[PDB]
């Protein structure tokens, strides 16, 4: 056994977190081809939505890793379907994703909780590494985001939508 | 001779399609020129335009040479002149490149049909490997550019004309 | 509109396909994560596993972008939890493997039954190009596995199970 | 004087964890010089436990080199000789390393309670940084070997001992 | 001693120019780190005013070395805080910006008169070499940028600040 100093609380949280991240990875995954439609067709967005899929996915990859060096045992329990099935307009994919990542960061901090409160600072320091930091710098980034979007809405939303897509996201 | 499993069905419809691709290269020299006026002056217009008219040419004579290897016969009609001397707006332009190549994509389709009924798997294994996909590539980019042309109309078509040829058409 | 000659059967059984390619990365995650474990440590079964589930979520994708492009929608379910949570011996997993993919070799058969039914040869052509010549092989790979791997069992299953870990999974 | 916020209380615990660390590399020095042993003769695992000894030895003196950092004083105790003058089996050995290695990750915990306690940030960093991940990392990969052995014993205990130390310690 | 034709007058006036060299380069980090907020987030702005901090520094220490080779005696006074805390739009912001610069182009000509009325050509040489060209430089292109800006506001102002920010500031 090399299991020490890891309570099956965290155990358990790290598991939940797991499925977070995955569920996160798919939502993107989903935003990432409603951006690809023919209909909708904004590449940027489309991309920018795909590389986040694949950094949430090794987020849980990482967490996965966590757990079995630390002796605990990965449980996966379905992934639920994203939230929305179209996701409106840029602005609204980019709200519906900060979203999303608040909700992500606040796990983060309910685990770093109980982490503190079983006095587990492996678990801390994992966090601290790996999660904290990219977490609020791309809440940060979707903030930026956000801003600049509506700057661009008011009279001529198509216009503001098209040059957004083309000289940020590029 | 060479022929063989070759029906004169399939050898006319093939000469057919020959002469549909070319017309398209003739169509899209047209719309390439058109947008080369001076009072119309939309470089990257023009440069797609003209790139269409030598992917067109190349498909038929990729049709042309596998006539020849089958042992059928090339049989050259008139091409016809394009459907309008001048083309509009880059999004009536955009409409008839869509039109025209779900005319051509048809055809391919209605050729498809008759080699698996003429029971003509090279024909069928042609069609896949050099037509099909990049039909289907090809109107998938152009319903993207239509959208974002149609998001970039309203208010200021003008403005949004130009941006669309400045940052997408590059 | 860019859709045609593409039926909403078609359409749909792309949707599940990708469902079912995804979820197969998923009992890949959990397969390799297993074999991780400080009590199970197959370094190169864990690499093969890992490996595989990053091959069906590109299986997956490229089915995504094949719906956009073709003009349908992509429609997401849940992705249901692989169906164990522990794998027992590198043969059992093994065999769960061949099972999942002779599972998803049959879905992909009964989408070509579908397409041609449907006289869809666009579809018919994505299938062969990336799918069914890759399925085959990996299949084929997995029998000779799976019969090393017996071959490697009776008297000394420890051993045989290191041994193949260590002299064909490298 | 620069000494900051840094407890008597660390300063001396510091110290024992010096000594335990250089312990540590003193008997890993035995494990391999026995595995070094004409009569013994098992290469690879002299070879891992040679480098555990210079890890642990580097451990002590990052630790020192903090303690001057901080304004403490270095204080060295005798070493004592390792528990075992021979140490059995590859298993044995393995066994014996692992105890060792929970043995110093508990005292790594012990000492960020009480670092904690003191409300001494700096030195948790410290402990994160360079100690907590890389034993808990040490500790996987022995239970990885222990569970790699394990399997490899039974009918044929010289054999699979051959086998392991031939093929993963390489 | 070294000091040889260097007036106390212009060691003072040498001393406050120092002083507001620095509370420009002061003004120029708030304002940079105004247009880094989320709620602003115009990364163009916000460097070039970063680079505006630096080079207000750079012309502080120019001078405090000058102070030197003459034998003054450099003395610091309080930094005061910039004139206000938020900065409100990128033309407010250039506006102001533009305001800063005149007053210190105005502090180095009324150094200039100093100079030649104490009969001080080494001062009068060195704001000739490094500042007066420098200083004038850098206020056409505030102008030019005001222009710009000015320009691009009225209907649409968001998106205006927007594209300056983009294809100007880039
Ligand atoms: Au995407
Ligand atoms: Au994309
Ligand atoms: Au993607
Ligand atoms: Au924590
Ligand atoms: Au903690
Ligand atoms: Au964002
Ligand atoms: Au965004
Ligand atoms: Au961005
Ligand atoms: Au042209
Ligand atoms: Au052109
Ligand atoms: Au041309
Ligand atoms: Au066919
Ligand atoms: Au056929
Ligand atoms: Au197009
Ligand atoms: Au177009
Ligand atoms: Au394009
Ligand atoms: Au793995
Ligand atoms: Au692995
Ligand atoms: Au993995
Ligand atoms: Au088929
Ligand atoms: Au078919
Ligand atoms: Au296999
Ligand atoms: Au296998
Ligand atoms: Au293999
Ligand atoms: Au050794
Ligand atoms: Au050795
Ligand atoms: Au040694
Ligand atoms: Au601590
Ligand atoms: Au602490
Ligand atoms: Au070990
Ligand atoms: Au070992
Ligand atoms: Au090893
Ligand atoms: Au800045
Ligand atoms: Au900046
Ligand atoms: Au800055
Ligand atoms: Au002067
Ligand atoms: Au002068
Ligand atoms: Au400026
Ligand atoms: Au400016
Ligand atoms: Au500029």
């Excluded at 795909?50 to 996915?57: I, N």
């Excluded at 977490?135 to 939508?161: C, F, P, W, Y």
């Amino acid at each position: 056994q090399i299991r020490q100093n890891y309570s099956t609380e965290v155990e358990a949280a790290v598991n939940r977190l797991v499925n977070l991240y995955l569920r996160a990875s798919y939502t993107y995954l989903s935003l990432g081809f409603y951006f690809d439609r023919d209909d909708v067709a904004l590449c940027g967005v489309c991309h920018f939505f795909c590389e986040l899929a694949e950094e949430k996915r090794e987020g849980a990859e990482r967490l996965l890793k966590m757990q079995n060096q630390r002796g605990g045992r990965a449980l996966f329990q379905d992934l639920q379907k994203p939230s929305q099935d179209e996701w409106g307009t840029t602005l609204d994919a980019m709200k519906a994703a900060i979203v999303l990542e608040k909700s992500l960061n606040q796990a983060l901090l309910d685990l770093h909780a109980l982490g503190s409160a079983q006095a587990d600072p492996h678990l801390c320091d994992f966090l601290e590494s790996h999660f904290l930091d990219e977490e609020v710098k791309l809440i940060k980034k979707m903030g930026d985001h956000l801003t600049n979007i509506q700057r661009l809405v008011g009279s001529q939303a198509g216009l503001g939508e098209y040059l957004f897509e083309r000289l940020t996201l590029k």
